[PDB]
């Protein structure tokens, strides 16, 4: 849900150590750029997303 001048927070999942993707939001494309880090667990109890 969008307000007029607010800021929308999304959650995503990746395998990229330097992820960079164009985020489509309803008309337009915004670029999301960052640096991901290794997680803390070796073996988890749910499959891959």
């Amino acid at each position: 849900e969008l307000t007029e001048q607010g800021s929308a927070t999304i959650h995503f999942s990746t395998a990229n150590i330097h992820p960079e993707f164009r985020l489509q939001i309803c008309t337009s494309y915004v670029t999301c750029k960052g640096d991901c880090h290794p997680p803390k667990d070796h073996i988890v109890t749910h499959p891959q997303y």
Partner: protein, 50 residues
């Protein structure tokens, strides 16, 4: 998470540090030594007097 550090052997003075996991929040660690003994293995042989 195996974290190794080194503390100087001096009482009274607080020793501070943190642990920076690469994608998480920094975890602060504080150690303040109070009293540091040194107890030898002591073996009585004899007593004496007047």
């Amino acid at each position: 998470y195996e974290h190794a550090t080194t503390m100087p052997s001096q009482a009274g003075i607080s020793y501070n540090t943190i642990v920076n996991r690469a994608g998480y929040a920094p975890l602060p660690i504080s150690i303040t030594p109070t009293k540091i003994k040194l107890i030898p293995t002591v073996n009585l042989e004899y007593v004496t007097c007047h």
